[PDB]
Design a protein around this ligand. Sequence first.
Ligand SMILES: *[C@@H]1O[C@H](CO)[C@@H](O[C@@H]2O[C@H](CO)[C@@H](O[C@@H]3O[C@H](CO[C@H]4O[C@H](CO[C@H]5O[C@H](CO)[C@@H](O)[C@H](O)[C@@H]5O)[C@@H](O)[C@H](O)[C@@H]4O)[C@@H](O)[C@H](O)[C@H]3NC(C)=O)[C@H](O)[C@H]2NC(C)=O)[C@H](O)[C@H]1NC(C)=O
Ligand SMILES: *[C@@H]1O[C@H](CO)[C@@H](O[C@@H]2O[C@H](CO)[C@@H](O)[C@H](O)[C@H]2NC(C)=O)[C@H](O)[C@H]1NC(C)=O
Ligand SMILES: *[C@@H]1O[C@H](CO)[C@@H](O[C@@H]2O[C@H](CO)[C@@H](O)[C@H](O)[C@H]2NC(C)=O)[C@H](O)[C@H]1NC(C)=O
Ligand SMILES: *[C@@H]1O[C@H](CO)[C@@H](O)[C@H](O)[C@H]1NC(C)=O
Lengths: 376, 60, 60, 328, 355, 373, 361
Amino acid sequence: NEEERLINDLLIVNKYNKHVRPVKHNNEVVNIALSLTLSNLISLKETDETLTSNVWMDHAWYDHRLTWNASEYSDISILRLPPELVWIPDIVLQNNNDGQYHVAYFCNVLVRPNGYVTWLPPAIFRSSCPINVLYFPFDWQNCSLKFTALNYDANEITMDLMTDTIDGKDYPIEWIIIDPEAFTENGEWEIIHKPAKKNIYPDKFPNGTNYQDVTFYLIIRRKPLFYVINFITPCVLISFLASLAFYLPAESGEKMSTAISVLLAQAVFLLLTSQRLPETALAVPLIGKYLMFIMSLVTGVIVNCGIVLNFHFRTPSEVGNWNLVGQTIDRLSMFIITPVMVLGTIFIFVMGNFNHPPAKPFEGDPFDYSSDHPRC
Amino acid sequence: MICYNQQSSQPPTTKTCSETSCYKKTWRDHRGTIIERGCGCPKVKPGIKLHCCRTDKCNN
Amino acid sequence: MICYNQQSSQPPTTKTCSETSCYKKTWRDHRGTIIERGCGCPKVKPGIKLHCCRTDKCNN
Amino acid sequence: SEHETRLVANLLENYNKVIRPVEHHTHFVDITVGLQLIQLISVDEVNQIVETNVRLRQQWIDVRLRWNPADYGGIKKIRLPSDDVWLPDLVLYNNADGDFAIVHMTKLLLDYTGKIMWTPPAIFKSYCEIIVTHFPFDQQNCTMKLGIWTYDGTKVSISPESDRPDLSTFMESGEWVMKDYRGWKHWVYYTCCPDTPYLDITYHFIMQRIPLYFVVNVIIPCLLFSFLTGLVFYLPTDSGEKMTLSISVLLSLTVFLLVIVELIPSTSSAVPLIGKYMLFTMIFVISSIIITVVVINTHHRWKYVAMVIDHILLCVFMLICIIGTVSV
Amino acid sequence: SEHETRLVANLLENYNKVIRPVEHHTHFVDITVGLQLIQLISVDEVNQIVETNVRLRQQWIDVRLRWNPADYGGIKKIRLPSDDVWLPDLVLYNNADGDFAIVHMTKLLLDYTGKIMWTPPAIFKSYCEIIVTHFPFDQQNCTMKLGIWTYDGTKVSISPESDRPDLSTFMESGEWVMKDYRGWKHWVYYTCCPDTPYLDITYHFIMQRIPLYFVVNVIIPCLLFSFLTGLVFYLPTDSGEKMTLSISVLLSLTVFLLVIVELIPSTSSAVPLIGKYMLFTMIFVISSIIITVVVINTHHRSPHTMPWVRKIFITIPNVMEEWKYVAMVIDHILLCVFMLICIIGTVSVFAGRLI
Amino acid sequence: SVMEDTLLSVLFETYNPKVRPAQTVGDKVTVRVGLTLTNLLILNEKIEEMTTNVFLNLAWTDYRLQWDPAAYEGIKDLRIPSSDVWQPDIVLMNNNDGSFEITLHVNVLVQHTGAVSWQPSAIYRSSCTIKVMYFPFDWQNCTMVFKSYTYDTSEVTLQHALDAKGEREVKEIVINKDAFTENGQWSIEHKPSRKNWRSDDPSYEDVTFYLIIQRKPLFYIVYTIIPCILISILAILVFYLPPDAGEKMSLSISALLAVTVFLLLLADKVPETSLSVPIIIRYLMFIMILVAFSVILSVVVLNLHHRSPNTHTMPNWIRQIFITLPPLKKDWQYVAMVADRLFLYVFFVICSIGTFSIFLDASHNVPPDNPFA
Amino acid sequence: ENEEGRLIEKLLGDYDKRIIPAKTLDHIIDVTLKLTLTNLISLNEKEEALTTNVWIEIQWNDYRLSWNTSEYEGIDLVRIPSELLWLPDVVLENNVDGQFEVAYYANVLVYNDGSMYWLPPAIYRSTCPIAVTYFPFDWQNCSLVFRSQTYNAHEVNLQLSAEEGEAVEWIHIDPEDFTENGEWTIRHRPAKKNYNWQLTKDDTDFQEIIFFLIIQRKPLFYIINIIAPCVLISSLVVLVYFLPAQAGGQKCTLSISVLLAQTIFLFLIAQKVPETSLNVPLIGKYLIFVMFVSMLIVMNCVIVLNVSLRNWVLIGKVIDKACFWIALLLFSIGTLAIFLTGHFNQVPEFPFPGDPRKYVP
Ligand SMILES: *[C@@H]1O[C@H](CO)[C@@H](O[C@@H]2O[C@H](CO)[C@@H](O[C@@H]3O[C@H](CO[C@H]4O[C@H](CO[C@H]5O[C@H](CO)[C@@H](O)[C@H](O)[C@@H]5O)[C@@H](O)[C@H](O)[C@@H]4O)[C@@H](O)[C@H](O)[C@H]3NC(C)=O)[C@H](O)[C@H]2NC(C)=O)[C@H](O)[C@H]1NC(C)=O
Ligand SMILES: *[C@@H]1O[C@H](CO)[C@@H](O[C@@H]2O[C@H](CO)[C@@H](O)[C@H](O)[C@H]2NC(C)=O)[C@H](O)[C@H]1NC(C)=O
Ligand SMILES: *[C@@H]1O[C@H](CO)[C@@H](O[C@@H]2O[C@H](CO)[C@@H](O)[C@H](O)[C@H]2NC(C)=O)[C@H](O)[C@H]1NC(C)=O
Ligand SMILES: *[C@@H]1O[C@H](CO)[C@@H](O)[C@H](O)[C@H]1NC(C)=O
């Protein structure tokens, strides 16, 4: 096996040091190209604002020390070496809830005779990303994974993007690579935009670990089916019953029961929705706005039908006149308030339903960052 | 109906089938690009291009 | 009255108290057999054998 | 044994676990991969993750670990640790949040001809495509995909030892039944490289959910409230208990909706039979409330027409409740 | 420092960390173990575990780690990592689900005479003994047992550093208050082994729960429900309204049962005071249901004729349509007796552990 | 490069990271401790714990790692892995869990003069007392203390970190605006830093970083205050209903059941600390007691309404007082109505005054301008 | 000078921890192990996992680690750390998580003749299916399977420890330093060596040592918070037969409110019952039955109201009185039979039904 001789010459005979970056002189930079393959989106449960996702982050850099003449040995074109024997540029996810900064599996690398090293270690990342609940559950979340090189500054290594070839020309991979056959869509979240960007901050200096950044954005829109079946429809129907409670005669003194019981069902729905969202105070959720609007309206319903009941049971110390007065005020109140409730619910739930993402990430950039139409 | 049943850039290979359609399926994964050839043309996941065809040996 | 206050197989020792009874509490743990001796005798958890004895020097 | 000590010393004097064990780098190391199912830890429908307890049976031949038994007292098997020999890095291609490779060492058996038998355990959290359409009477056909992560087909080739996984020591899950289970080996070629095969093995298990927990917990009370709500129409309007009974069964249905929504999976991929039946019951109750409010309005406006309307509504809603609970 | 580098190189040349530091094998290593309670992290009753953040401080002398300060320039204290010297293996005997030994190393302090000063931290999930009988007015006395695992008394001897645990830097728990903390050492001999003592050190902390969360979240609503359920008897039967009030206060109390069982620990060793009170209140409300039902049945009786009933119910009014009057008298009698029962039961259930 | 390898071999020929640097016996190593707060993850009060992602600035001068750049191809600084260089055990002391040491071990940066820098990231979970008596309208101090676990003031001397352009020290938690995400329910008003000693312990010194953060209660305000206001409106309305409707108890006890439902809702989200009662729980109990008194007084109203001369005889005192306040059964309904109106006015006064007082008490809670740190 | 240093340096010199200690071929290392339960931490039915803190002791013989006590200052017992010696890879196979090995790697006590005494404490998340048929009045039969992870029956011989000449075929319990779990009480605790006859002498799964734990739940928390409140509240549906059948008689709201309280109890029991779909829990059966009883109550109230407000009221009262006894008898016999079936479920007085031995010291 010529592999024995090749490895011994590369690592031991030449005195390979894995703690020194591969440059000829200590003024050149190491060009490190990154990609990101999203194996699957596990969940984005909103209580802790975690984006847990299995990703396949791919590296590619040049190591002049890991080079050899193929013809001198047997025709060995590809070589494999564990990471703990070769210089591995450790880039970490800067934003993550847990303490996992590196990749999950430190898999074997591939090195060519020219020194081109490629590393694709799988990783499970639980990043921290804020959630705007303003248009819940019809909301789209725009939160990303931020990768930075904390071991070397931008003066020593540079985090570029992977470049591939289609017609002899190189174009950067400016998106998260998704395997259309293998990828199965998440049961709650739909991926709309997957842009990738390299960030340079002119505020800080190149001789610093926080001058360069590579960010893999993920704009995903929730599928509003569970909530429109178990939260929206029954609440709307019981609100409709609250509105219809005015069409009940006051002779049977049992209208208060219907109104207050509908309000209590509203309280139960509030209980249910209170444990589905984070305690974020940036903006009131659309479910929260709708629920408080409808409960205020139901309280107004209760107060108004209480006024009707008090007017109905008036006495001189003729009763038909009071009964007709109560019926007239009840009909007038119904005609006033039922359209208000119907229009309010329709307006709220078409305002929420009209929340498509802007179809263009980075609003000040005409590029759509889609794999179908690359840049170069 | 005769059409190629090979995959990617293998040497050409044909098979006989009763369907009147023959398809070429192309998509890219984390490593490279895959071309799949066969008879008929069924539904595919989003992001995959397909080439439903009706004549003999047209999914080259 | 006088009982024995030794434990396990220690050299014999004697003690006097206001109770007119002795005891010898023997139980097995993961390392050996333990014997506890004194005067009187209390209630014990299941699995322990007692020798509640009213005479003198009877818990040997 | 001093003889086995001599084996362990001599075999590892000049052994590199970094380098794959082949006579010439052109050749390939053949590996027979086998799976042995033990139990299903859980099946997470909302997260689309299936967690299982398996041990991965791997067999392959090492050319640098041969010896003559007659030269060493007649022994023919040793138990070298995993971290002392070369290992194929078999990983899950569809891992959700588990460990991609195997993190248990479990010293491997090594024959005198070079054959190596490794059986380390693992907790495979494979990503599972959950189809909530006939829940709970649903079938799951989600798999686990295995393959060599860094080596390709012409370097390291994996073959299934049997056409189906091993379930001779399977433990009954209690809510899942295996109708079928097989294993397939896939050849995939890339346009980069016409003669570089890439091999993987997918072990797919067919699972039937046992529909008893959700039936006695979610199905019985839905039918229960549904049969209640059509019964209010037989009450006379004279007693002031019509709205009370109707709205109170509605409120009990709301609390039941609460227990369902905290019980059934929250996945939004598709509405299941549970969701359809819950919606049907909810619509039934709402329509009952509206029409019986109209009934009271007819009464306090007429008694005979109100009563005959009530009987007709009772018959119609019994009929539609029966057909709805039978169809779903 | 070059002197300290030379000293470290000299000390760790022939040193072996798998041999206890005694001049002769018959000797024993003398160790003084002491604890520092930093905080009481949590006490869960259902799993019967107490978890706290401590750092056990132990001292011993290592003869073969001594040196002459005058030779090495005058250094008297050095800071070897704990991974390369001999360490006693103190093991929490009543560990529930934590770590038996420690996992943090936290390099020790070594003196020129061989004395070792090592204070590593550890979170002890020590098994507790929970008595839920006066909960939430409960006092717990569960311990924290430490001892050498593999060695015995004649080979490795441990003694407490101080008669009490160190609580100088113990922050307030916020839901527990500590009466007493104490440290005891026990010798145990086996029927084997007539002159082989086995040593351990047991630290116990008397913990009393601060009863303000449960009183104002779990007990006051119970008091309100108990007061309200007996008040339906003042509401006249003429309105069809006794039933709704009583059954709805029962339903509200059922929802409060849901929340109380969501809050109260689910241990089943014994019925707690809160559990006894809620069971009492359940029985009280149910009895009110039956009594209200029989009163309503009495009210709407009508001619069967009214019997001695009018003889006592029409003498009772003298010491303070006929069916309505007797129902009213019965309702006031029951309201009075039910208020009395409610107040005496409330006093008696919490009588004790508060007096 | 080859020259970097030569320099690394020369520097680490006789250097061990287990020896504290000291020119002379008894010298002190001045370690500068700083902190950049990337984001404030959570401050859940159920377990009395705050989780933060921070970069922990360190800077100490190690004499052994100094060289002449003129003889090494003009190289001024090197990136050496943190395990190959001595570092002080600067760890978090008031950590709720057992994680004392920094999570991420980034390689150190050493200049040719011996100066060493370290910016290791960590996910620190520190324990901090929660002053839950104005909850949720409260601000938390929630300190965070850093010190060298093994070295004391006789071996190291902790100091404050230096800014980017280093002439003056920074005495506060600096934030990189490029990498920072607001929590969404907490706002960082004050973020001072101060070194602490103890008179009883002359061998003690730490660097402490505080976070005077005031909660944004909009979620709690809406989800509890608004339904509680509606419940109070129902409880004040139930009087205005006529007794003849025979439905006062339905509304009253439904409101009480609702407020118990919100008690169930909030019992999950309130901390289980017995030091004091928060404002929100006191408000919930005030509303519940108000509804209970509404139920009792409405029972009294119904009892006075249904009384009849054949069963009850009007006393003289109620006749004069209830027929006094307005400025044979018909007298009973009239007294019932007058008592009802009196109860309505009384509960209006009580509810309005109590709610306004509670909200004013919980609204005048503002963190001080000077954090006293 | 501590001569234990001389012994350690002599013994561990030219000692390989990856070698079976067999003297020659056909030598099987007889491994004797006994289990000492310290704490039964918990048993959650949702995950079907049993958590216990156990101190398993392992004894075996190593000919390479024997010396002559006469020439080493008369010492015969030495403590060697476990990571420097060969150990039999005995692991708990039936674990929900991946914690096969022990928690604390304690020192190994070597003797003069090469004997071994290893007592590593461990915490195990062992698995055991839950028999929910008689919940909560149920007894669980949970097991702990120990077998060698690597060596087969031709290399090691697992067996129970022998004390005083009699094998300890039980899990040792310290009678004076043991406290009950507080929800589970331990009735039986046998231990027996088991063979997998479907599998040959090789393949590492032939032999095993199984430590059983037959434990019965203490149903005091469930009775006072779920069972008794449910039966007390739903005993109220029979009182609808004494209320008048008119406006204000107000039977329907009582029936429906008791039913809604039973629904709230269904929610409450939802967090306690496990997800096993093999058998319906006994309390679940009782809950379904009692909701059906309330259903008959509601329907009967409906017909009583219809008859009393049509026909004539007295015949409605006759129907009411006649059906009150039927409903009361039905509810009483149903609840009594269900709770008698639950109570009569007791642990069998034999650990193994066919085995006459008691399996207890
Ligand atoms: C708690 O659960 C445990 C297990 O979950 C219960 O323990 C069970 O108790 C049963 C009652 O005693 C046991 O049944 C008895 O098993 C033994 C042994 O069975 C094994 O050997 C059989 C015979 O093999 C020989 O013959 C074959 C044919 O010639 C040969 O091919 C072979 O090489 C052997 O030479 C074999 O057929 C079988 O498959 C087993 O491998 C039998 O001898 C008894 O007849 C069984 N019945 C009785 C009444 O004794 C059962 O084995 C045992 N399980 C385990 C895993 O040990 C325990 O009872 C439960 N506690 C309760 C309910 O309180
Ligand atoms: C998704 O979020 C990212 C980052 O939060 C946005 O990118 C930045 O947006 C701001 C807001 O206008 C710009 O000032 C920046 O120039 C953008 N880029 C960077 C690198 O910060 C992005 O616009 C968001 N997209 C959508 C559709 O919301
Ligand atoms: C936050 O807490 C710290 C300490 O926990 C407070 O710092 C103390 O402030 C007082 C008042 O100036 C000093 O007398 C003490 O010496 C300080 N230190 C200690 C340890 O008590 C700080 O004032 C608190 N912040 C606020 C806003 O109250
Ligand atoms: C980084 O470069 C700037 C630019 O002049 C300089 O001011 C600063 O001191 C440098 N920092 C270091 C650590 O060399």
